[PDB]
Amino acid sequence: TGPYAGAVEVQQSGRYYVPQGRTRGGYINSNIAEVCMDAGAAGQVNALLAPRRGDAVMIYFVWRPLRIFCDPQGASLESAPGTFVTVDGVNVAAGDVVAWNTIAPVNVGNPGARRSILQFEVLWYT
Amino acid sequence: TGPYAGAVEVQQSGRYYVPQGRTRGGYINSNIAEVCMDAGAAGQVNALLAPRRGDAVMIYFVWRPLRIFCDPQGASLESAPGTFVTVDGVNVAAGDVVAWNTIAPVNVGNPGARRSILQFEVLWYT
Amino acid sequence: TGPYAGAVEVQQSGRYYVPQGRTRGGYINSNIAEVCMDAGAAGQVNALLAPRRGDAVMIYFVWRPLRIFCDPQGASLESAPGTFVTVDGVNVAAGDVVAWNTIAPVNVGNPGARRSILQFEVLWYT
């Protein structure tokens, strides 16, 4: 089991999908979620990464941008540079394992000039 | 391990591919298999999730429709409302965990009016 | 954990990307790496499959070509037949688990007439 096993729908990985607004997240499978982000966008992603309340007290995860992904038409696109993720105000790097308490704010930012998709993969949990 | 380690070919997740018939399933990796379905299609999927006789014992898996995926030319598509899976004549809701004894029939249906892709993720087994 | 957690970027699975050269590798998630190959290409893949020096020292993996993937504009493509991988000079079939030490040469080949994408999935490592 992974924290997102009970999601009732998943989506294809790497396909940009943000129908209204500037950010949108969805699940890929039990352990991976992705947030599609327009240019110059920022948002909080707690509701998305958090396992259902009462289920966990701590989640371990890593994040990273997708070097290549696609637009709604099937065309290749590359993530903007300068994407960041802060956990409890601390800026966390892509590739580093971060211990999240389930409570603290996880902010995601895409200051860059093109669209980007960020992936969060939950590692071990409990 | 995972039950489908050993499949000899996998495919890109979320890409609609039904060359012959009204349904087709394939593997995505060791714990995940997807099944593409045309509008108003039904299919039995035991042989796909039935790993190989003797190794298998009992399988616990979840299934969920893909909210967005693509057609063979790369355009975004959304799964039709109304998909269902019955495991041994019992209706299983997306996201509910199901114990499968490996022998009962797993039916899959897409009574709706557009294509859909269903994902089956295997959580544990032995 | 998994060996490719630590990779600082990932890419969409099954989307052909080889901007300069005959083959290119990238990571999909913590246990999976994909290598795109132009028609009639070969290359050595150690640098991609190797967990960083000192961490791991024995990797078990399986590899398999993708039956269907896409080109950069999103159209469906099928992997050419005849793909092969050799680990320390031995031929390893798709679907077979191979034990690797991180040192021995891993050759990859696409003798066929068209593009292909091979998948390497790491199963355990101690």
Swiss-Prot record, chains A, B, C:
<comment type="subunit">
    <text>Homotrimer.</text>
</comment>
<comment type="function">
    <text>Major structural core protein; binds to structural protein VP3. Constitutes the surface of the AHSV core.</text>
</comment>
<protein>
    <recommendedName>
        <fullName>Core protein VP7</fullName>
    </recommendedName>
</protein>
<comment type="similarity">
    <text>Belongs to the orbivirus VP7 family.</text>
</comment>
